């Protein structure tokens, strides 16, 4: 009784007229399926394939998003943490100044925090502004008899902009601290952006191919069994593992997906390990008090040579915890694409009393074919589909173009060089 399909099709929601009791005899399904049912069942067959794959790898999209939101929130907090800590130490020792000149540190980090969150891309002039704002106020402390009305309404570019080769008031501290601050803001940024792509990459990469060549005769896999015979013959592994590979042999991100998690860990280690953050959290205060000491004993040369013109939330999780917590989440992601076919053929299919044989392309006959191929050279011997001459598809092949430059952008940033 083909009406066994009728109730099963009623669960899927078909208008059960002209399908219950009648069977007659770039295409599909060589049957108790009507003409318009076929054209509408392949569309129904494709739907689960998308929803199954996207839900299968859905946790990579959520993990990279969760680590992003918790790493991005971490860096912003430690910027605000160090801003408040630098004010405490400098107010204790010196009761002569800084009593009402802590307003510069607010404008210092705020422009630093714009380089981190891409709000701006100007840091070399940003630091020169800060050193100048300190330069035009410490300078008169050892020159108290003199008073200075600045030139025009702005002293200069930013008073002694050091351009054109001024004998630096703070000798080497501006260059040294710039090198230490620059390597930090760019390393913590290429890491966050790298995670930001990873979410976007896998999110759109999970949107599954339409591949009409794969879609047509995909119905043969699981759909057309319902059309002719009873639906109790859920397909076994042999047939399944090749149609899901042949339809997905394009998205072979495996060569470019491995180096990505490598660069994520490599940059994380240099960033987790000191010299990239917690050192430059206190290095600012050390070099500032060191540069002023150079000034104190080298002001005789510079001041004499400058007679001319004007002269509540939960505290940031420890980065070490945030790194091995990051490391564990990523361990289950490296060999993900190779293990993707097993999960897809390991859900609705009970392959894991009745029998072992299952449905095949043209009957219930026994199957013993091969089923490992995963790239164009490997899937050129495709028994059940027609993979493209070069496996990678036109939009995907553009996900190994702008979505692996971050790896080199994270690797180079881990060295100190950027752009």
């Amino acid at each position, epitope marked *: 009784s083909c009406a066994e399909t009728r109730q099963v099709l009623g669960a899927r929601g078909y208008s059960l007229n002209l399908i219950p009791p009648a069977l007659i005899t770039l295409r599909v399904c060589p049957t108790c399926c009507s003409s318009e049912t076929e054209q509408r069942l392949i569309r129904e067959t494709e739907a689960t394939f998308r929803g199954l794959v996207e839900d299968t790898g859905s*946790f990579l999209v*959520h993990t990279l998003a*969760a680590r992003h939101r918790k790493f991005d929130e971490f860096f912003l907090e430690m910027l605000s943490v160090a801003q408040h800590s630098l004010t405490q130490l400098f107010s204790h020792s010196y009761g002569r100044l800084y009593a009402q000149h802590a307003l510069i540190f607010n404008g210092l980090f705020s422009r630093l925090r714009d380089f981190y969150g891409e709000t701006g891309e100007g840091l070399d002039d940003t630091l020169a502004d800060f050193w100048a704002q300190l330069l035009e106020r410490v300078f008169p402390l050892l020159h108290p008899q003199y008073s200075f009305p600045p030139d025009y309404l702005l002293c200069l570019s930013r008073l002694a902009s050091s351009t054109d080769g001024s004998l630096q008031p703070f000798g080497d501290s501006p260059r040294r601290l710039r090198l230490q601050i620059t390597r930090t803001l760019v390393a913590a940024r290429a890491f966050v952006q790298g995670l930001e792509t990873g979410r976007n990459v896998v999110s759109e990469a999970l949107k599954v191919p339409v591949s009409e060549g794969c879609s047509q005769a995909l119905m043969r896999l699981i759909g057309c069994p319902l059309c002719r015979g009873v639906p109790s013959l859920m397909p076994c592994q042999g047939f399944c593992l090749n149609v899901v590979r042949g339809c997905l042999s394009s998205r072979g991100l495996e060569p470019d997906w491995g180096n990505y998690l490598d660069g994520l860990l490599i940059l994380a280690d240099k960033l987790q390990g000191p010299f990239s953050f917690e050192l430059t959290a206190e290095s600012i205060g050390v070099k500032i008090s060191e540069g002023l000491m150079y000034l104190q004993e080298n002001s005789a040369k510079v001041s004499a040579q400058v007679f001319q013109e004007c002269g509540t939330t*939960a505290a940031g999780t420890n980065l070490h915890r945030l790194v091995w917590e990051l490391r*564990e989440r990523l361990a289950r992601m490296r060999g993900f694409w190779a293990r993707l076919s097993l999960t897809v053929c*390991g859900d609705s299919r009970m392959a894991a009393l009745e029998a072992a044989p299952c449905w095949t392309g043209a009957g219930r006959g026994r199957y013993l074919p091969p089923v490992v191929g995963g790239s164009p050279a490997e899937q050129v011997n495709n028994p059940e589909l027609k993979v493209d001459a070069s496996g990678p598809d036109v939009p995907t092949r553009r996900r190994r173009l702008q979505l692996r430059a971050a790896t080199a952008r994270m690797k180079t940033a881990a060295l100190g060089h950027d752009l």
Partner: antibody
Amino acid sequence: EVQLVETGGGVVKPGGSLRLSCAASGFTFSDYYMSWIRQAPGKGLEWVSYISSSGSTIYYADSVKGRFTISRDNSKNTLYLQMNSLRAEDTAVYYCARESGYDYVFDYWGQGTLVAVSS
Amino acid sequence: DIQMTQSPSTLSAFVGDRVTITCRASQSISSWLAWYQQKPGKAPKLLIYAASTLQSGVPSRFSGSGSGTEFTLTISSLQPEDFATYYCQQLNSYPITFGQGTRLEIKR
């Protein structure tokens, strides 16, 4: 489809030991983070433990730090929980859940099986 | 060591009304907040995670918007199968804490 079935007795006196199994099917057990959340006869839900997918990181609540132990079996696809020397306060309905990927969200919960401590 | 709160404890509303459930936390939580629905004596469902994002299968009538220490959960048009107990969660600290449920009953 995605199924989390729990088993284990629930009627023991103070000092008795119970172990619960959270048999999982419908998805690869090795990818996701698992956890245990209990619901007392009261309204609120209390968190007790959680374990990494590989099993490398284990967390216990402050009220279950010494006498509680959680394990894992990615081959059999089963989540366990060792309940030892439970006090009367441990009386609750114990669920097992799966972390969808985002930190501490539980999209799929178990049917529930209750543990009772009484003399 | 972290406290979660909800309001109100019990809200009476008709089928087809607009319902807003407010959750309040002790300390700041940027976007780490989850919502759950629990019918009597059965397993809870995941409604809204990450403050504002909906879970697959949850209808469009469920909405949640919050940033900081004040959060809400909105039902645009109440359908008869929405009468249950709704729970708040935390996704930041090591001791994750739920808020006591808000019971949504039928008005009569």
